[PDB]
Each structure stands twice: as C-alpha cells, then as structure tokens.
C-alpha cells in the first residue's frame, strides 16, 4: 500500500511546519515546562491551523 | 493595547463526516449493459466467421482446381 503513506507524510510535513513555527524544533519541540507553556505561539497561527483543519 | 493571538470573533466550523457518494451505477443495469453489449459482441462474431468460411471455401475451390 504504497502511496498514502506519501500522501498522509505530506499532511505531516505541514504539521511538522506548525510545529518549527511555534518551538523552532523539527520534532523534538520540548516547548512545555512545568508550570505552563514557555514562549508562546506567534501571530499569524491560528487561521493556518483553520486552513489545514 | 495587547497583542496575543485570539480568533476574531469566532471562526466558522469544519465537517467532521465521512463524506462518501457511493455513486455509479447499480447492480442490474450495469450487468445488463456488460451482458448487451457481450451479445453485440457475440452476432458481429458470428456474421465475420461465417462469410470468412465463405472465402476460405473458396480457397479451397482454388486449390481443387488448381492440382491435376
């Protein structure tokens, strides 16, 4: 089943964009201490997620 | 003024259904039209090889008087 494998990863590839966007990280977006989330999201996020939702 | 990120009033919703058309055709039409168009298949072939067997008895005639 080889393909949607590539079409879902190209969704993830827009997720992991999100993700560089608000931590900086590829993957490994440590980004939640203990106590609240450190550095939060910037401008200009929320309608991208409406957009990909 | 603060400047944090809200939504502006309220964002509009997204589906959440399994949208599916489940459309083309249905059981018997399209079993019927495989079948019609089988036997069209089916009196075309028949009307060929029966004036083909009309040329190549010919051809035989051909070979008959050909040989003595």
């Known amino acids: ?53 | 003024v603060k400047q944090d990120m809200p939504p502006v009033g309220g964002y509009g919703p997204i589906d959440y259904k399994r949208n599916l058309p489940r459309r083309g055709l249905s059981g018997y039409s399209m079993f019927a039209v495989g079948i019609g168009a089988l036997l069209f298949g089916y009196w075309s072939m028949m009307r060929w090889n029966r004036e083909r067997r009309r040329l190549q008895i010919e051809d035989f005639e051909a070979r008959i008087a050909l040989m003595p």
């Open chain 1, 1 to 53: 089943a080889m393909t949607p494998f590539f079409w879902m990863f190209e969704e993830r590839e827009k997720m992991f964009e999100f993700y560089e966007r608000v931590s900086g990280a590829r993957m490994h977006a440590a980004y939640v201490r203990p106590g609240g989330v450190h550095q939060d999201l910037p401008l200009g996020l929320m309608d991208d997620i409406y957009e990909f939702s």
